[PDB]
Amino acid sequence: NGNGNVCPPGLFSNPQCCATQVLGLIGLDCKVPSQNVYDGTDFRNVCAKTGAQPLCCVAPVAGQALLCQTAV
Numbered sequence: 001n002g003n004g005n006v007c008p009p010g011l012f013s014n015p016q017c018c019a020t021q022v023l024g025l026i027g028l029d030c031k032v033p034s035q036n037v038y039d040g041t042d043f044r045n046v047c048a049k050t051g052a053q054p055l056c057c058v059a060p061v062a063g064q065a066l067l068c069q070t071a072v
């Protein structure tokens, strides 16, 4: 479900739907999407479902807290 059609090349390459985010770089309760996203619109909207926040983290694995960045 997405992989970088919504995220930057590199380190914040991985799209996760997250609970919230803190400090501008830590994403929390991050689950990987439930649907391939192609843009921000489907990123923000596919995430919203869970009441979550679209982010681009350094890992593709779900995690309590991950070093993320907010999706564009």
Ligand SMILES: [Zn+2]
Pocket (backbone or CB within 6 Å): 019, 029
């Ligand atoms: Zn949760």
Ligand SMILES: [Zn+2]
Pocket (backbone or CB within 6 Å): 038, 039, 040, 041, 042, 043
């Ligand atoms: Zn779209």
